[PDB]
Amino acid sequence: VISSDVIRGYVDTIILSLLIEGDSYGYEISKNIRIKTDELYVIKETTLYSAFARLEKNGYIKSYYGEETRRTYYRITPEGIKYYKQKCEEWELTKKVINKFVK
Amino acid sequence: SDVIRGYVDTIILSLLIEGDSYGYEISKNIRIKTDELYVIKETTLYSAFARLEKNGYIKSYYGEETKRRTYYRITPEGIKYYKQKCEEWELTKKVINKFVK
Numbered sequence: 461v462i463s464s465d466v467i468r469g470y471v472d473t474i475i476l477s478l479l480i481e482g483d484s485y486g487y488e489i490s491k492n493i494r495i496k497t498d499e500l501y502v503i504k505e506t507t508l509y510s511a512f513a514r515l516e517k518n519g520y521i522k523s524y525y526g527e528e529t530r531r532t533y534y535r536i537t538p539e540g541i542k543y544y545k546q547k548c549e550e551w552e553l554t555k556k557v558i559n560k561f562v563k
Numbered sequence: 564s565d566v567i568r569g570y571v572d573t574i575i576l577s578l579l580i581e582g583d584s585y586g587y588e589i590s591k592n593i594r595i596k597t598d599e600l601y602v603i604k605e606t607t608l609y610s611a612f613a614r615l616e617k618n619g620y621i622k623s624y625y626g627e628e629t630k631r632r633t634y635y636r637i638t639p640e641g642i643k644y645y646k647q648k649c650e651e652w653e654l655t656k657k658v659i660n661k662f663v664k
């Protein structure tokens with residue numbers, strides 16, 4: 461297991477990161493998180509679905525709708541790509557700080 | 564951040580492994596070591612001393628009265644916790660590095 465405190469800081473950035481690869485939807489995103497982390501991080505549904513809500517409200521992603529049978533898909537916005545890049549730079553600084561002490 | 568909250572204690576324990584220390588000196592060493600990138604707040608630092616001591620990870624002792632300075636020394640359990648948090652950090656970096664590029 462990993463730091464809950466750090467991961468809380470990066471949930472949105474991790475979801476944005478997957479959306480930069482391609483448009484996606486709730487179940488695919490959480491599936492992709494656990495698989496790509498080698499099972500080290502499995503995201504809670506409540507964590508995931510309040511993140512979408514926040515990401516949308518903030519204007520970092522947009523919803524759209526598949527065919528009726530309707531699935532909600534998200535696509536990352538230019539404003540969401542810029543938030544992602546800021547958080548990437550932040551992660552680099554965060555790492556630099558903690559690697560000094562935690563060796 | 565609330566991100567650094569996860570490793571405040573481990574940062575203090577790390578300095579304590581290099582030697583006994585006290586509040587002003589721990590704070591200065593953080594400033595210096597990070598070259599200003601991290602400066603711990605006085606409330607955060609005294610909270611962490613208090614929690615570390617509650618948890619049995621450090622012990623306080625006292626200098627001469629000149630008021631008396633409060634020193635801390637890491638315990639064997641403090642070292643155990645430190646090394647589990649190092650492993651955790653490496654795993655954390657792995658996870659976040661997977662996405663944040």
Ligand SMILES: [Hg+2]
Pocket residue numbers: 461
């Ligand atoms: Hg594990």
Ligand SMILES: [Hg+2]
Pocket residue numbers: 481
């Ligand atoms: Hg992928």
Ligand SMILES: [Hg+2]
Pocket residue numbers: 562563645646649
């Ligand atoms: Hg270590």
Ligand SMILES: [Hg+2]
Pocket residue numbers: 563646648649650651653
């Ligand atoms: Hg380690």
